[PDB]
Amino acid sequence: HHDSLTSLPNRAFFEGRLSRALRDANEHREQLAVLFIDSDRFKEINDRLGHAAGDTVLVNIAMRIRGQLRESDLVARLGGDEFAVLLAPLASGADALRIADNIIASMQAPIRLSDGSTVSTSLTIGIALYPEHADTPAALLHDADMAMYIAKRQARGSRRLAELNDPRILQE
Ligand SMILES: [Mg+2]
């Protein structure tokens, strides 16, 4: 199924694909990346400007994310302003960073609202590499999830790689 707003698959889909892609990427001794994406200032937008505005921003974000992928990559909508992105196959971690950087830069452009006004926001992106960080869907997902949290907390609108001491940084 694909959500009616943005036409994007849901987590259930995303996990299976990631599973299949992980089994695959293991076999050919190759790399893949998971990106966890959360919009910045979302609640503020809906409060100050209302559902319709929010939805518009979601649709835009969705369009801009897919704008930066290759036919082989996958965007799912987790829920809310939050999306999951599968980057397979991958030449290098560098590549993942670079794509993230482009998704981030994509947001420098303002978003046209239904009344012709304009909002600017950011995304925050946590990135988790295979096989450097984890080797199971659940784990990889979790790691990206956490990296994103840490990123929102450290500086909004940025991308951050999962580190191995991430649970210690979460604890402190
Ligand atoms: Mg948000």
Author numbering: 250 to 421
Sentences reproduced from the published study:
Bacterial biofilm depends on the modulation of cyclic diguanylate (c-di-GMP) levels in response to environmental cues. The GGDEF domain of DGCs is emblematic of this control; since only one GTP molecule can bind in the active site, a dimerization step is mandatory for the cyclization reaction to occur and yield c-di-GMP. Consequently, multidomain DGCs usually regulate their activity by allowing the GGDEF domains to dimerize (active dimer) or forcing them apart (inactive conformations), functioning as conformational switches.
Since the dimer formation is a pre-requisite to enter DGC catalysis, we investigated the possible GMP production of the isolated GGDEF of YfiN from P. aeruginosa, an inactive truncated version, previously shown to be a monomer able to bind GTP with high affinity. According to our hypothesis, the kinetic data clearly shows that the GGDEF domain of YfiN displayed the side activity accumulating GMP, while c-di-GMP production absent. The versatile reactivity of the GGDEF domain seems to be related to a conformational issue rather than to an altered active site (as compared to the catalytically competent site required for DGC reaction): this may explain the alternative reactivity of the same protein towards GTP, depending on the allosteric status of the protein. This hypothesis has been confirmed by solving the 3D structure of the YfiNGGDEF protein in complex with Mg2+ by X-ray crystallography at 2.8 Å resolution. A magnesium ion is bound in the GTP binding site, coordinated by the oxygen atoms of D287, S288(CO), D330 (belonging to the GGDEF signature), and two water molecules. Superposition with the recently solved structure of RmcA in complex with GTP and calcium, shows that the metal ions occupy the same position and that the two water molecules replace the oxygen provided by the β and γ phosphate groups of GTP. The GTP substrate docks to the GGDEF domain in an extended conformation and a side reaction leading to the formation of c-GMP can be excluded given the position of the 3′-OH, which is too far from the α-phosphate to perform a nucleophilic attack. A closer look at the position of the phosphate groups with respect to the substrate-binding pocket indicates that the α-phosphate is particularly exposed to the solvent and, if the catalytically competent dimer does not form, may undergo a nucleophilic attack by a hydroxyl ion, thus producing GMP. For YfiN, the conserved active site, confirmed by structural data, and the high affinity for the substrate are not sufficient to promote DGC, given that the conformational activation is hampered by the upstream domain(s) truncation. Despite that the GGDEF domain is evolutionarily conserved and structurally stable, its function is strictly dependent on the neighboring domain(s) or sequences that, independently of their nature, are required to ensure the proper dimerization to enter DGC catalysis.
